[PDB]
Design an enzyme around this catalytic site. Structure first.
Site, PDB file in Angstrom:
ATOM      1  N   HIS A  38       0.860  -1.060   0.096  1.00 40.30           N
ATOM      2  CA  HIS A  38      -0.041  -0.130  -0.003  1.00 40.30           C
ATOM      3  C   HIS A  38       0.962   1.174   0.001  1.00 40.30           C
ATOM      4  O   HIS A  38       0.431   2.342  -0.296  1.00 40.30           O
ATOM      5  CB  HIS A  38      -1.090  -0.131   1.245  1.00 40.30           C
ATOM      6  CG  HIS A  38      -0.639  -0.464   2.701  1.00 40.30           C
ATOM      7  ND1 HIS A  38      -0.239   0.656   3.455  1.00 40.30           N
ATOM      8  CD2 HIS A  38      -0.576  -1.564   3.113  1.00 40.30           C
ATOM      9  CE1 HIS A  38       0.184  -0.117   4.593  1.00 40.30           C
ATOM     10  NE2 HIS A  38      -0.139  -1.181   4.501  1.00 40.30           N
TER      11      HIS A  38
ATOM     12  N   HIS B  26       6.291   7.103   5.609  1.00 37.05           N
ATOM     13  CA  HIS B  26       5.948   6.753   4.580  1.00 37.05           C
ATOM     14  C   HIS B  26       5.178   7.914   3.895  1.00 37.05           C
ATOM     15  O   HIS B  26       4.971   8.987   4.501  1.00 37.05           O
ATOM     16  CB  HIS B  26       4.903   5.318   4.650  1.00 37.05           C
ATOM     17  CG  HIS B  26       3.855   5.671   5.296  1.00 37.05           C
ATOM     18  ND1 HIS B  26       3.931   5.292   6.759  1.00 37.05           N
ATOM     19  CD2 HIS B  26       2.700   6.322   5.308  1.00 37.05           C
ATOM     20  CE1 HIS B  26       2.972   5.878   7.367  1.00 37.05           C
ATOM     21  NE2 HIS B  26       1.925   6.843   6.499  1.00 37.05           N
TER      22      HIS B  26
ATOM     23  N   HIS C 256       1.994   9.220   0.847  1.00 33.33           N
ATOM     24  CA  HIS C 256       0.739   8.978   0.081  1.00 33.33           C
ATOM     25  C   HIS C 256       1.090   9.909  -0.963  1.00 33.33           C
ATOM     26  O   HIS C 256       1.492  11.159  -0.592  1.00 33.33           O
ATOM     27  CB  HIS C 256      -0.207   9.426   0.934  1.00 33.33           C
ATOM     28  CG  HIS C 256      -0.590   8.648   2.432  1.00 33.33           C
ATOM     29  ND1 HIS C 256      -1.314   7.352   2.574  1.00 33.33           N
ATOM     30  CD2 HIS C 256       0.127   8.668   3.725  1.00 33.33           C
ATOM     31  CE1 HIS C 256      -1.270   6.960   3.751  1.00 33.33           C
ATOM     32  NE2 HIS C 256      -0.512   7.625   4.465  1.00 33.33           N
TER      33      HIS C 256
ATOM     34  N   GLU D 237      -3.495  13.486   2.212  1.00 29.56           N
ATOM     35  CA  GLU D 237      -4.695  13.029   2.769  1.00 29.56           C
ATOM     36  C   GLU D 237      -5.164  14.094   3.494  1.00 29.56           C
ATOM     37  O   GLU D 237      -6.359  14.470   3.480  1.00 29.56           O
ATOM     38  CB  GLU D 237      -4.164  11.949   3.901  1.00 29.56           C
ATOM     39  CG  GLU D 237      -3.471  10.945   3.233  1.00 29.56           C
ATOM     40  CD  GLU D 237      -3.701   9.435   3.994  1.00 29.56           C
ATOM     41  OE1 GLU D 237      -3.189   9.529   5.276  1.00 29.56           O
ATOM     42  OE2 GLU D 237      -4.513   8.670   3.344  1.00 29.56           O
TER      43      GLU D 237
ATOM     44  N   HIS E 134       4.200  10.804   6.415  1.00 31.98           N
ATOM     45  CA  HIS E 134       3.830  10.670   7.590  1.00 31.98           C
ATOM     46  C   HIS E 134       5.020   9.965   8.435  1.00 31.98           C
ATOM     47  O   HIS E 134       5.814   9.053   7.999  1.00 31.98           O
ATOM     48  CB  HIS E 134       2.636   9.591   7.671  1.00 31.98           C
ATOM     49  CG  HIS E 134       1.598  10.263   7.062  1.00 31.98           C
ATOM     50  ND1 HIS E 134       0.515   9.328   6.701  1.00 31.98           N
ATOM     51  CD2 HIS E 134       1.094  11.499   6.994  1.00 31.98           C
ATOM     52  CE1 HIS E 134      -0.622  10.187   6.349  1.00 31.98           C
ATOM     53  NE2 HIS E 134      -0.245  11.553   6.317  1.00 31.98           N
TER      54      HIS E 134
ATOM     55  N   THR F 167      -4.981   6.454   8.990  1.00 33.70           N
ATOM     56  CA  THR F 167      -5.410   6.482   7.960  1.00 33.70           C
ATOM     57  C   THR F 167      -5.904   5.284   6.905  1.00 33.70           C
ATOM     58  O   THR F 167      -6.313   5.319   5.642  1.00 33.70           O
ATOM     59  CB  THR F 167      -5.016   7.832   6.936  1.00 33.70           C
ATOM     60  OG1 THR F 167      -3.793   7.446   6.491  1.00 33.70           O
ATOM     61  CG2 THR F 167      -4.971   8.883   7.784  1.00 33.70           C
TER      62      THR F 167
HETATM   63 ZN    ZN Z   1       0.391   7.715   6.355  1.00 38.01          ZN
END
Ligand code: ZN
Ligand code: HG
Length: 258
Positions: A62, A92, A94, A104, A117, A196
């Site tokens: 992911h 990591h 997004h 996010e 994050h 999240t």
């Molecule tokens: Zn995250």
């Protein structure tokens, strides 16, 4: 089947396997800069990453996580709205399929190209697993990324992506300094929230930095070349691995600045 970000297993389907998805303190949220409350009592953030020890980088299906040795207070976060010391375990990103989306959290509805994050857990709880059972168990530092000039300190990460293209693959990734990803100012917004991605546990004190860092088009382009799938399976590009904003409900977003 297993959760993801596709039309059939994406964010809007998560509640079926993880009911907490419709909880009272879900993340991310839209940050309305005009209703955020300036709290003069908020202390400055204290980021001590000089003794950080990176160990590995891993494609988990992911996103890709850079893991750190958290068996001792080597890279910690304290101060701000926090009580106690929190250890860095991994960071990591997004990101989106296009530069106009990927983050996010949003600011006044504005989406950024990506969001970093840095995940930390409260040391009073002994281990990460025990920390996720507490309302103040985690502290996540969120940093927005905008497309512009290349970020020098991010190139080592970009270069190693080639080795971890598919799900399950990992590579040694020692001696990486997370300080190279921090913006100049440490001004922030903070509110009580959650993870999240499933299990979406409501154990996070979010600290979102006001100032975003910039990365080059070529740098975010390499993120988009990763695969959600494992080796030997039909290729699915790892893009748009972000969750939409959730209702703020009975929560107040506090700003450390004015
Ligand atoms: Zn995250
Ligand atoms: Hg929790």
């Amino acid at each position: 089947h297993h959760w993801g970000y596709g039309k059939h297993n994406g964010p809007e389907h998560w509640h079926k396997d993880f009911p907490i998805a419709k909880g009272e303190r879900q993340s991310p949220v839209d940050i309305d800069t005009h209703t955020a409350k300036y709290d003069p009592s908020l202390k400055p953030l204290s980021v001590s990453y000089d003794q950080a020890t990176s160990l590995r980088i891993l494609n988990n299906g992911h996103a890709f996580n850079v893991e750190f040795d958290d068996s001792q207070d080597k890279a910690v976060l304290k101060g701000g709205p926090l009580d106690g010391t929190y250890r860095l375990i991994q960071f990591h990103f997004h990101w989106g399929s296009l530069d106009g989306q990927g983050s996010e959290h949003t600011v006044d509805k504005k989406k950024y190209a990506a969001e970093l994050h840095l995940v930390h857990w409260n040391t009073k709880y002994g281990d990460f697993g025990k920390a996720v059972q507490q309302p103040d168990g985690l502290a996540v530092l969120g940093i927005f990324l905008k497309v512009g000039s290349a970020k020098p300190g991010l190139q080592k990460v970009v270069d190693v992506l080639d080795s971890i293209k598919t799900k399950g693959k990992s590579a040694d990734f020692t001696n990486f300094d997370p300080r190279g990803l921090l913006p100049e100012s440490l001004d922030y917004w903070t509110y009580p929230g959650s993870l999240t991605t499933p299990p979406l546990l409501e154990c996070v004190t979010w600290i979102v930095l006001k100032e975003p860092i910039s990365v080059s088009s070529e740098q975010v382009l390499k993120f988009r070349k990763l695969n959600f799938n494992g080796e030997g399976e039909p290729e699915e590009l790892m893009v748009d691995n972000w969750r939409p904003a959730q209702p703020l409900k009975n929560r107040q977003i506090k700003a450390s600045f004015k």
